[PDB]
DNA sequence: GATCTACTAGTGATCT
DNA sequence: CAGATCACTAGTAGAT
């Protein structure tokens, strides 16, 4: 079981935010995460693992500030100690940067690249943001490997389509080439 | 190839709106459509088939009017003869109601029940709706059978956890009503 | 291998 | 003036 939320931005584009609070569930989310997912955790303390799912080709640097602060408010509110302390640092890095060494007890994670870890400090607490996110809170029992399988199949199909387009363009090229000779 | 749009509600809940590229891909949409999908088409004219993905458990009568008018604007704008008029009736029914006979031709679809077909009228035309939805447009090449398989697996897991909860519940209940 | 059918793929033109 | 469709020709999978 995984938690799901939605964060709308001023861009008129909505983002999906899924959170496990469970160490085992956090392991399953670490396993099957997508390349478009951004991992959020409170820095020094224990907290739930909060994921922000970016659109395709969207870059971590392009995350709108309001959705970022939504994820940071979410992971701060779900930090056991963090929901008390009023200035807290939230570390977030792309799921592609999460490194699981076998020395890691279940549910704890490392990083491939220290440069790719970003940090954002949340001051105090905002009840309005948490209310808005709670309106969109829904529970799910997904098959993570299957859903990522669907994602990868879509990427494969898009690449194949791109290849077909290229071959069509090349055939039209050669056609105009012979028609100019 | 399938087009995907996002319609935000006034409560700031997002809805997915998908529309096929051609009528054959739309046959693919008809085949693998989800039980949460609501099918949209222009009434008695020729148009695109625009689908709305409802939240799990949401009912066709629960649709917010803004999302409904977004979908209806989307079929109207994509209709050959429909984008040119000022009043266009749009029929919509749950995907579960769609019936496809081998007699039917590509782009045509029937209904198991006439009582489940609904109508909503689009008056005039709005460019702000169309452009707003256009900024969320994205092209995808999904595997629809695998995606509906994922949805059904989620439903299965949900029902399993449910009947597990009932099993533990009636267990503890039998213990209490036994020893008390 | 020798026919044969039954399908898919490719291509140029012609129609919207 | 891009895409759908027609009218072919040519290639491939089985099957006898």
Curated annotation (Swiss-Prot), chain A:
Assign the protein's first listed, main location to one coarse class.
membrane
What biological-process terms (Gene Ontology) are attached?
Answer: positive regulation of cell motility
Give the compositionally biased regions (Basic and acidic residues): 148-181
Q: How does it sit in the membrane?
A: Single-pass membrane protein
Q: Which GO terms describe its cellular component?
A: endomembrane system; plasma membrane
The top of its lineage is: Eukaryota, Metazoa, Chordata, Craniata, Vertebrata
Its family remark reads: Belongs to the CCDC25 family.
Q: Which residues lie on this side of the membrane: Extracellular?
A: 1-66
Write down what this protein is called.
Answer: Coiled-coil domain-containing protein 25
Q: Which residues are modified to N6-acetyllysine?
A: 23
Q: What does this protein do?
A: Transmembrane receptor that senses neutrophil extracellular traps (NETs) and triggers the ILK-PARVB pathway to enhance cell motility. NETs are mainly composed of DNA fibers and are released by neutrophils to bind pathogens during inflammation. Formation of NETs is also associated with cancer metastasis, NET-DNA acting as a chemotactic factor to attract cancer cells.
Q: Where is this region: DNA-binding?
A: 21-25
- Transmembrane regions: 67-83
Family matches, as Pfam families:
NFACT-R_1
Task: State one molecular function term (GO).
Answer: DNA binding
